[PDB]
Amino acid sequence: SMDDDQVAFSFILDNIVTQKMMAVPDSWPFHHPVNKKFVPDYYKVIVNPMDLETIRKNISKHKYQSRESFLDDVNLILANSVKYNGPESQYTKTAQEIVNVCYQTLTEYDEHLTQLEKDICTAKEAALEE
Numbered sequence: 001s002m003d004d005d006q007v008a009f010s011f012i013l014d015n016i017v018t019q020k021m022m023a024v025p026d027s028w029p030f031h032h033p034v035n036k037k038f039v040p041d042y043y044k045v046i047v048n049p050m051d052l053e054t055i056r057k058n059i060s061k062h063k064y065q066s067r068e069s070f071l072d073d074v075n076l077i078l079a080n081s082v083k084y085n086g087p088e089s090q091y092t093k094t095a096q097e098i099v100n101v102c103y104q105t106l107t108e109y110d111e112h113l114t115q116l117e118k119d120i121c122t123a124k125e126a127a128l129e130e
C-alpha cells in the first residue's frame, strides 16, 4: 500500500518466474544451475552462467529495481544456450519460449510495473539525499 514498493515488485517477479517461466514445457534444465556432472565443459564455454533459481535468489535480495536489469539476466539464459547448444537446438528453443513467456507477462502487467518502477526509483533517490 505504501513504502512496500520494492517488496511488491520483487514478489511479482518471483511469481512470473515460478508460475509462468518455470511452467514452460520441458523447461526444467533451466530451473537450476547447469550441473557440471552432466555437462563437463559448460563452465569453460559459458563465462556468465545464469538460470531461474539464480534469478529467484537475486529477486529475494531485491537485485532488480526495474524490469530492465531483470530482463538482462533472463535474456542471458537464452544467449548462453545459443552459445553452448546452437541456435536450432531444442534447449535453445525451450529457452526462447522461456524468454517469450517472460516478455508476454511483463507486457500484461506493463502499466502496473511502471508504477512500481517509478516509485522505487524516486524513493531511492530521495533516501540517498540524506
Ligand SMILES: CCOC(=O)Nc1cc(-c2ccc(C)c(NS(C)(=O)=O)c2)nn2c(C)nnc12
Pocket (backbone or CB within 6 Å): 028, 029, 030, 031, 032, 033, 034, 035, 036, 038, 039, 081, 084, 085, 091
Ligand atoms: C552437450 C549437449 O548439449 C547439452 O547437453 N546441453 C545441456 C544439458 C543440460 C542438462 C542435461 C541434463 C541434466 C540432468 C540437466 N539438469 S541440471 C539443471 O542439474 O544441470 C541439464 N542443460 N542445459 C542447459 C540449461 N543448457 N544446455 C544444457
